[PDB]
Every structure is written in structure tokens, then in C-alpha cells.
């Protein structure tokens, strides 16, 4: 066999069917002879690749596979790579090499010390020595990012490597089956429910890899169980909880002393599946009031280790949350009482205010939506506003940046074809990976895409205000015209200048067979 | 408080309580007012304060933490680490860097791009952004080094730092607990149970990890109840398992074929804490017969990648082994008979043949001494000669790296006291880190130190008539006279011609209060 | 052709025709069928491999070639490569790899990541795609450590690649010219002779790529028509100009407001061949006073980037030496008046003075001998007491790190065997690279090795004083007898307890036909 038809019957073996691309010349020698089981989906820059492919991994919980080329389509992509390390994305990145015998002098195309381009956003990254050790560093690539805590992982390969012949020994890797799925050990873990038992007032906070690991159900039983109100981690990936259970409070503010003081009088505070914490704005004050104590379970040594506090258990979110929520007694304390329903703003006959586009989503949009974040200005309106019942639904930028939400959006709604993707995006960001609404037309994918434009980078401004900074340049956006570039990139366009044409918009798109852009004129801050 | 007194009640919080050094003009700083309750053990030359550190963490079973000098001080380590990465010895190393006022100068003592020197032989390398910083990142690299994988870390600190006020809420960090004590899930672990249960010829192979856990009683009893022998995985750096006991079977060869032909037969083979394998010479055939499968137990993810064949469970040793122990059946299989006693070796009143040096400490020492191993050429002999009833009974540099035992076996005497300490060195490993022998005289750690002196490289000669490979140089080691170089140390010295010497120098040296280098002439290859 | 053949071919067509080497298993099928055109020159430890092949190449002027094994085997020369970096040293490090059909699976003996393992402290670091690429890569290194800036270089050669065939074109790497051998452009020269000429109180200071370039004599040249005062830059590596012309100043002061002081009244300082500035304790203030301005010649951009003050300009150091020296006016200034002789020490019959040593040694030493230093209290004074005439004279750890003079010394010995090489080691710093010995005894090279025994670690202790810092461990370190280690390698030794027995041994030493240690008991600081 040729290392081209061993590593196909790797990567088909290991549950992997799909290639998320931009090719180059590197490449072609991997992409010939494409096997009919795969499919090829093909994005216009490497970030809209990724962003794809990484909506997809998260939303599908299984890793995704990338090709992209050499050293310029990997580093176009290195934004992506940075939201994937944050939310630990499953991706296997690959990309093409010069062939060995033109690596040392240079030519065109070689990726220069490849191995170093994507540190330090990758898990494991790596060049063979020699074309028969590439299905095995391809296995290795496999398990590196699927193993917990997830993450993406780089691989680069000679394209001269593909038609050598393959080590016959590579079948022993096609079904290995590598298992990351721990929880603490008995003895230790009787101790920790003994403490949550013992609690007075305990409460709880999550963060994404609960909804990585599908874990939403078990924290409901837990929250239920212990009476115990439940936050989501500051900066939220994604949501891991029912926003509209009685116990839900909500996301929590990103800054030390709001934390500490939100947390007052909590004596155990359990956080799983969060970093301890993704903080933003500087906030100084105390960690946690006296009264407090943190216990952090997390997928990852790196969260375990940097917490300024607390109690840490570094194993994975689905047994843990499963173990706890079968093990801990019934309190009979009160259930907490539900949140009460935000307020309508008032809304004239103009712009749009964001919660009236929230409000209106939440009244039209299937029980089954998922929603995509990148309307930076707008985040805490949005997690009061809708009620998101189901895991899976919802996607914010891990790493904070920006041309994440796009792309992912068309991957989400892949991986999940019955579920209507809404990804809610400024009009700065839409800008960032604005080339991938070409993929979502091409392959039919029905994505809906709210541009929500002020005209400014909103988030920024208003952070300009907080520093009382004068005179910083770059915040504005005039002139860009959407439905414009929907068009040009084969996308439905509509557009939504007040609340009639938005209801009306939405009607529209929801009824709609392919993919659809509304531009929503919000207003200015 | 400032970041010293912080520092070190951070450190003596978390179980530290002695600083492996060799002082430089950075590190005067940290070192100065240095508290009554901790212990400083100096060492003349860096590979063998880390050697030192590394067989005391090794044998405590605990974080070993390291003070060297800068750039230079820590690349005169860098040999040591790499036995150190691969034994998964956790190591706090740290290093100091000139004031943060000169750094960008490059004044002299600058370490340059610090935190990527002793890349990638460490699990996490840092320097802080500020002063008040340090206590939060040596809280860190304390957690790095000590959760599973276990391994080294490194930590800048420039000098200045030390005398700046620290945070008040670094004081969260004192108490932190933090736990990777896991295993597999009850489910995944009832199934790995009852394919042991079922397997008709179970074999079981033991690494490293397995005596870093303090797992081996629970090994005996679990390869008791299946009925199984037991190897120790190749290029063994520890001994797991009790090597008279019935099961054993001794050090597997570091050969693929070797071990796919041991293997034959054995439908199940199950590894515990070891990597899958760690190969030495090449000797390429199939990685497992047919009729024989893999699974692996391993605390590394890096080594359940990288296995060619097999499944793998990524989980703490010492949980996995004990909950295995308890949960399989006992097989109704004859229990494995017992590897009958090596044969003596025809002995004259010349020159010591290896086997009869090992043959004699097995008679002459206490049943619960402790051995090292740095006589390249003779590791299988010793393997089959010495009884090591007890864990924590044998060291080997894990790399392969020399330079290790001497250091390494004054470390593990500090850690245990009343079990004595025999390092058996090469005439040519014994100068990679001869200066080492000074600590030993200093502290009176009293290391036994068993030079077999055949005047070459000897593992490397056998390797050269291998290949057939004529005119290979520096093979040779004539003209060191060790109980001089143990005199210039202050180490009491012997020497053995004969057998009757070998054994007059042993009776004083078990007798002795203090160190004792004994210099052994071996039979040339 | 094999790659084995063309490589050595490429070596001697190069000039190379020495390895300084520590072997291993990987390094086998490299040195095997060994030329008889070239040397091996064994060390027992990394770190003397490695400072032996520095010192050689240093007083050699051109690159040598260092084998060593493996991870391990590089990590041990380290310390020994940061010395090597600061000093421009052009080093070609090679290391074996195991066989690339073991890489994958990390074998014992794999180099894992191996061109990150020496950065930061190499120009160029490097693993080979394939072995036909193998000849280019070592041209690569080769080339890459000549070129100005020189500095070390890194080859990692998997083990199965030399038996390879070569490629047939690699014939035209064999007799490759480079050349760095430039200066400033001649409208841009003029400028600066100008400035110079019309200076009315010009200084120059001298580094160490002054005497790496054999620059010294146009220097002096300079330095009389320019009628100025030339002082070494601080933590001076080499010595670039005879230390009794009537210009000498002696070596800079290694503090910022200390240099400032030193060069205010002088309008113009012209620097060659330094740092700007190599600064160790820290005094701040002006970095020049108000009236002075700098210019600094350097052959390396990054001194030239990272100069806090002056202009710069990036060239060799010889060409532009020589061209200054040959175009500016005799200045009719009177030329500067020699510094007076120093002072003798008060010196009674027991213990001696650095002074008496150093007054001595320059007394009964040949006029072109070659000192080390690694003494490190005792630096101005020897520089005070030392009449050094001619280039090459003068070699001191550049990076501070300790460990490189009695290694460099040997290879200093063998660069220059009409040259009396004499090494002044302090105590501490002896056991750094203590088995380095070994070398000069195997291969009679008849190095002076003076130990300087006051016990401590003085300059550190020095240093504490400074910084009133009480209670630092690990400064003293007694009980160390160096004529017995001597013995122990193989090497004559002799003890000078007074300064009769100094006259007398250095007598006996200085008649010597072989290598010489001599233990000087000096007085406690
Ligand atoms: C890749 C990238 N570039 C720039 C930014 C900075 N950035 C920018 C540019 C923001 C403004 C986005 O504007 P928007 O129109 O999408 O939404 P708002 O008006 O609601 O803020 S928020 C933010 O952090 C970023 N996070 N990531
Ligand atoms: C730091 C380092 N340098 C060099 C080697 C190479 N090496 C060397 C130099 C060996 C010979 C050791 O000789 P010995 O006298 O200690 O024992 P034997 O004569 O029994 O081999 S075995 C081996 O792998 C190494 N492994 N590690
Ligand atoms: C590799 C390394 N380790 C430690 C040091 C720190 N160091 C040490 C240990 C010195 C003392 C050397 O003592 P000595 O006996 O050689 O000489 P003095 O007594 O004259 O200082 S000076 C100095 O910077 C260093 N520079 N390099
Ligand atoms: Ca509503
Ligand atoms: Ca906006
Ligand atoms: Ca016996
Ligand atoms: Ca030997
Ligand atoms: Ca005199
Ligand atoms: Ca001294
Ligand atoms: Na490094």
C-alpha cells in the first residue's frame, strides 16, 4: 500500500470522513485520487477553513480534519487556532511540505521550521523523518487532539511522501482506541461529595467544556440535587445550561471583585469545566471573600494549574459530571426561584435597539436554534434574552477574536443539518472572515447570518469611554453595504431598517431553502 | 510581605522544604535571609545538583525543587533534564535573571529568551511579567511538575523581584490542593475487567511509573490473581515488581521483534506505566503477533499517542493498578513457576567478571538496599542477578543519558536513609558527573559507590562489532585513577583487584559511616 | 558516493580536519571507517568537549567541529554554548539522531524536538528531511558559524543516513568561498574619518571581536594616530590590545554610571569589536554624560540593535579596523603616557595575594604566553599585572559561565603549541569541567592549570557583602584536594603553599614536558 491509501484508511477508520480546505500545490499530491467516502469542503481563505471545520468539531463533539498550504495558508489561519486553543477544539491541521529533496534550499512553498509556526496554539506539532512514519504521526495527530483536554494539532508532510510505499505495519494503528474518560477515585471523590452535601449554600458555575462534553443534563441533575444557583464562567464559549431553569443565574462578569462578590456567602463554590476564571477588564480585589471555598474540576492541567485559588481536579467533565450528579443526596433546601423575564426596551419606529433584535429571535426562532456570537458590544443582552433550552446552542470567540462566528456557523450547521443555525454578528466583525458565505452557498449550507450594524466597533468605543481615552483612532466602520457582499459571495440578502422589516426579514429567511444574510440597522452608542 | 517571605511559605505550604542549588550572583536575592527551616544541599556543578534532585524526587515520590544560576547554570543542567523528562521526575527548577532594569541591554548573566532554553525537555518553562507575579507562577510550576504526567518544570525570576512588595491575595495560593488521581470510568473499567477475566494467556508488562505510583503491590496481586508473568517494559528506569517472585520474567529486550516474539501466544497482553515500548536497538519485524492484542494503562497522554499498536487508558497509575487489583477474578491457571537462579560464572583470582560482582552484592547487601545502575554494558546481568524485593529499589538514567547514577544515587540515600545505597558506575559514566561525589563527603550521605573499572566505553564497543565497524575512536577510557578522584573529593576509597578484595571492600564499605567509593577492576570486553 | 564520504569530503575540503567529540550509539555509523587525514580528540563530559573545541577555535580564528550524542550529549555541552554565543564562537555542533524508522515511536537515544533543544543559544539549528539533504545541511552549518557574526551552529544527523548514497551534486558544495569580509561604503567611511580627525579629545574602546579578527595591531595603529586612550569594554571575553603600550587604560568598569563618568570630557568614544555595554552590577545614571557622543563598530546587528546610546555601524571588525587604522591623520596631540606599573602587594610567608600570584606569573612566564581566567574575585587585578603584548593572550568566560577555562585551555594549548598556555582557576570554578584533565593528559598537551584554593565561592561572597544580604548558604566550599584529582586524570601536580613554593613549582612547571596543575593556598577574602 501507498502512505496515501494507508493514511485514508486511518483517518476513515478513526471516524474521520470529512476534509475542511483551501488547497495549494503541496497538497495536491494528498488530495488526488480523493476517496469517494470523503467529503471536500472547500473555503476561500484559511481562516474561514478553520473557523468551519472548528464550528463543526464542537458542535459534532469529534475531531475535525484540516489541509491547508505550507506556511501561508497555515499562518492565515493562525487566528483560528487561537479560538480553537481557548474552547480545546479537536483539530487535526495538516499542511503540505516542499518535496524533501528541494526543503534544504529553499524553494518556493517550503514551510520554513514548520513545526515552530503554529506554537503556541497547537497540542503536538510535528514533521516526519520519512514518508513510512506518516500514518503513524497522523495517528498520533488523531489521538493528540482528541485525547482530554482537546485541542488542535499540527502536522506538515513532504508532498514527495504520499506515493512511497506504506510500513505494513501501519494496520496495527487503524483501530486503536485511546480513552481519556477518568474521574477522580473513590476514596477522593466520597470526600468531595461529602463536602457538597455538607454545604449551606453552595453554588455552581460551569463553563464550555460541559457543553463539549455534553455534560448539561448531569449539571442540571446536580444543580437540582445540591438546590444550588448555577452561573456560566465569564468570557462563555459556549452554554452549558438550561437558561431558563430555575436554578440558572446567568453569565458571570468577567472582573476579580465582581466575581468574589457575586459569590459572597457561598461557602462551596463548585466551578466544572471552566478556567478559574477567564477574567477580562481589570477589576482588582479579593479572589473570593472569607467564607469562600473553590473547588475546580477541568479537563486540563494547564486551568488546574493557574487558578489563584481554590481546590483543583484535573479529569474528565462527562464522568466527573455524571459521578457527582448520582452521588450527591437530595437537599431540602428550597429549590432557587427562576430568574425573572427581562424588560422590553422601549423601541420606536427607527434603528433597532439590540434587545429588541434579542427578543425577537427568542419569539420566532425554532426551540431548537442554535445561535453564534460575534456582536461584541451586545453579549450580556443577548444571554438574558434567549432562552436556549437544548446543549449545543450556543458559540462565542474562546480566545476573544474576532471572524470566528461566521465560519463557524456554516460548520455548526453541518454538523447539525436539523437544528437552525442563527449566528448574531457586528458589522466590524463580519468583515474578518466575511469570504466564508461562499462555502455556505456552494454547499447549500442554510445558515442565517444577523449582521447587527452600528457603524462602529461598539466594544471598543465603549471601552475608549471607560479609560476616558481621547482621540484613539480606528473605531468606526462606515460604509459597508452587506446585502452587497451577500451577493457577491451567492448569499440571499436582506435587510432590516426597524422592527416591521425584521419580523418581516426573519419570516423570510426561516421559510428560506439556502443560506440567508439580514442587515439590521441597530442603533449607534 | 514581600515576594520572598511569600515565595517561601508558598513553597513550605506545598510540602518544600529543601533547595537543590549552585549559588550564582541572580540567585543571591532569593538565597539570601534563607529560612531556618529549609535545608540548601550545594552541589560543585549543575548536571549534578539536578541529579541529585532527581533521585531524591524519584525516591520521595514528591517534588524535588532546583536553584541554578542563569543561562549557563541551566544549560550545564540540560543532560539531566532530558533523564529527568523521560522518568517523569518532578523537578521545580529555577533560575535566576538579571535585573529587570538590564535585561534589554543584555547585560552580563542576561538569560536570554529564557523560557526557551531548556525546551522541550520541560513541561512548562516561564518568566513572570512582574514582580508580585512570581508567587502565582511558582505556585504553578509546583502544580505543573506534580500532576500526571509528572515531569520538570522551569521558572525565571529576575533578581530584583525578590525584595518587591508581594500581593496580599497571593495568600489563596498557600493551601491549594490539586488532584489527578483518577481512573478509568465504572463502565469502560467493567469492560476492561472482563476482558482480563476472560483472556486465556494474560501477560502483563510493567514500566517506570508503576514504582514512581507506588503501585507495585497492587501489581503483584493483580498478575497473582490473573495467573500472568510479568516483564519489566525495555530500557527500564525503575523496577515495578519483585524480581524473585514467581510471576517475573525479568527486562524485556528493546527490540520490536524480540518483543513481538516474546509476546506470541499471549492473547492479552496489558501494560502498565510504561511507553509502548521504549525500543533501543533496531531490530524491525511485526509490533504483535497474530493472537495477541494490547492494552495500555499509561499516566502520559504523549505515550498513548505514540504507541504503534494497541488500546490505551490515559490515567494515574497508582488508581488504575489498585482499582484493577480488587476488581478481576481469581483465575483458576496454575500460578507461573519461578525463573530458576542465574548460573555462576567460572570466576579466577584475576580480574572481576560482572556477573560476579552481582552475584556477590546480591549476597552481601541488606535485603532492602537500593541500587543504580550506570554500567551500560552489564544491565541484563544485573537485571538477573540482583533480588529486589522491595519498590524503589533500582534506578537507570531513563534517556539513557550518563551522567545520572552518581548524582542520582546520593539524592535517593538523602531520601532514604536507612535503606543503603549502591550505585554501580562504569569507569567511563563516573566522569560525566564525578564532582558529585563532593556533596556526598560534604552532607555524609553515605552512598555506596561500585566502579567497574574495564578501561572502555564498553556498551559502545559491543555496538561498533554490531556493525562491523572498524576504526570507530574515543573508545577508550585508559588512565583515571578513581580513589584518587574520590580522595580530591573527600570520599573514602578502596579498590578490588580479586574477588577476595571485592569482598573485603564491601564488608568495610557496609560497615562504613560515611560515603565509599570502591574502584572494581573488570574484565576488559 | 556514500553520505558518509562526501561529508568528510566536504569537512576537509572546508579546512576541517579535527572532532572534538564525547561519543554514543547514534554517533557510531558517523565516526566509523574514521579518516586517517583527521583527529579525534576525546573529553569525558559535554561541557569540556565543548570548551575545548571553543578555546581552539577561538585561538585558531576559524570554525571546529564538535560530535556529541544525542539529547543528553548536547544538553551537557549547554552552558558551555552560552559561553560560546557571547563570544562569537564558530562552533559546528553535530549530534546523532536515532535511525528515522525509530523517530516516530520516540526509541531510547531519540532527540525529541532536537533543533529546539540548543536555541536560544545557536545561530542555526537543524534536522535534515532526508539523507541525501545531509552534505548540504553540514554545508549550511558550516558556512552558517563562519560568517560574521560567528557564533555555534547545530546539526542533528539521524543515525541510518550516513551509508546512504549522496546525491551527485553535492560535489559543488566542497569548495564553496563565503565571505562577510566588508566595511562602510566610502562616502559613509569618509564621514566617520572625518569625525574623527576633527575629535579634540577622542577614546576607544576595544571588545572582543577585536582580537577574534586579529585586528589588535591596526588598533594600536589607530589608537597612535589618533593620539587617544583605549580602554576593553567591560567583562572583557579576550584581550584586543597589548596591556603596556602607552594608550592602555585597562578594562572598563561594568557599570553604566561608572563607564559614563569614565568617558565624560571625551567628545567622541569610537567602540570596536563590543557590546555596548556588557554591564553586570547594576549603577545607573547617564548612560553617557552631555559632551560625549558614541560610535560603535560591531559585526553583529544584534549588539548594534540593542545599544541603549551612539550611532553604529554593522561590519567585520578586521576590514574595518584595518581601513580606519590606514585613513585617518596623525593627530598632533601628544600621544598619552603609559600607566604606571601597580603597586606590590605587602606579602608575608604564608598564604598569597591574587597579587603575588598574578606578579609572579608575569615575572617567570615567556612574554607570549596565554592566560585563562576563572578566578573570578581576582579579575582587575590580573588585569592590572599581566604584561599581555601580543593577540591571543587572554581568554575569559563571555557568557560568565563557569566551567569554560580549564577545558578552553586545552584547546587553546592545541591551537598554539609554541604558545605557554597558563589557566588561573579559582577553587569553585575547577569542578565545573574538572574531567577535562583527562584530555590534556591523553594527548599531552601541556597546559598550566593554577588553582587559585581560598575555599569559597568568593566573587559571590564579594557580591553578598555588597547587597548586605546575611544567611546565604552555599558559598564555601572546603575539603576539595586538587593535586589528587590532578592525579586521578592523570596529570602532574604540585602545591604552593607560600611564595617560595610558588617560585619553585612554577619552575618545575614551566620545565614541565607535560600537562601541570599546581595548587596555590591563597588568602581567604
Ligand atoms: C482578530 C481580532 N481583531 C481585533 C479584535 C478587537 N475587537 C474588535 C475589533 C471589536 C469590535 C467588533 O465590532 P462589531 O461591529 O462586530 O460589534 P460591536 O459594535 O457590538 O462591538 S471587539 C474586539 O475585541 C479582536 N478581538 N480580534
Ligand atoms: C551524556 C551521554 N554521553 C554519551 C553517551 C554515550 N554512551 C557511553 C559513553 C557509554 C559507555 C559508558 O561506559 P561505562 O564504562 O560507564 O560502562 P560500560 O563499559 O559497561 O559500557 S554507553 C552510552 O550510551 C550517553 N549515553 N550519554
Ligand atoms: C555555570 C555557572 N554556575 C555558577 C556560576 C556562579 N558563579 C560562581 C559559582 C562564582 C564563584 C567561583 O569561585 P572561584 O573559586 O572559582 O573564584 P573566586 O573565589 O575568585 O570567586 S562566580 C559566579 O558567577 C556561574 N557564573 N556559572
Ligand atoms: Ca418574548
Ligand atoms: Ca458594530
Ligand atoms: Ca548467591
Ligand atoms: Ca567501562
Ligand atoms: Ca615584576
Ligand atoms: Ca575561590
Ligand atoms: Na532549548
Redesign the interface.
Known sequence: ASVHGTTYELLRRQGIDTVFGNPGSNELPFLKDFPEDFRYILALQEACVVGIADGYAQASRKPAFINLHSAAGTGNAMGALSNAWNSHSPLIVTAGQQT??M???EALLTNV?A??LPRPLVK?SY????A??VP??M??AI??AS??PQGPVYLSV?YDDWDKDADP?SH??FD??????????DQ?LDILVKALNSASNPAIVLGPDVDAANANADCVMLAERLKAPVWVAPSAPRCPFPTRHPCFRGLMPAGIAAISQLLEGHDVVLVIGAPVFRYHQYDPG???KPGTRLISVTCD??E?????????????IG?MA??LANLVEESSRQLPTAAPEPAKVDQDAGRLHPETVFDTLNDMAPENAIYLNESTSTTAQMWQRLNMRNPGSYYFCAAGGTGFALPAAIGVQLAEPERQVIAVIGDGSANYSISALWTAAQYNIPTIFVIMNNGTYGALRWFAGVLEAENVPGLDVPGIDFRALAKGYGVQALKADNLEQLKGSLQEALSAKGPVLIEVSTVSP
Open positions: 524533501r529533496a526543503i534544504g534550499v521550521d513545526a515552530n503536538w514533521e516526519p523523518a520519512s513510512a512514519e503513524h504521526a495517528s498520533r489521538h493528540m485525547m482530554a513532504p505495519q496495527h494503528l486503536r482506541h485511546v480513552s481519556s474518560s477518568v474521574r477522580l477515585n477522593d479579593q479572589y473570593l492541567p494547564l488546574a494549574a493557574r487558578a489563584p485559588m481554590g481546590d483543583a481536579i484535573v479529569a474528565d464522568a455524571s459521578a
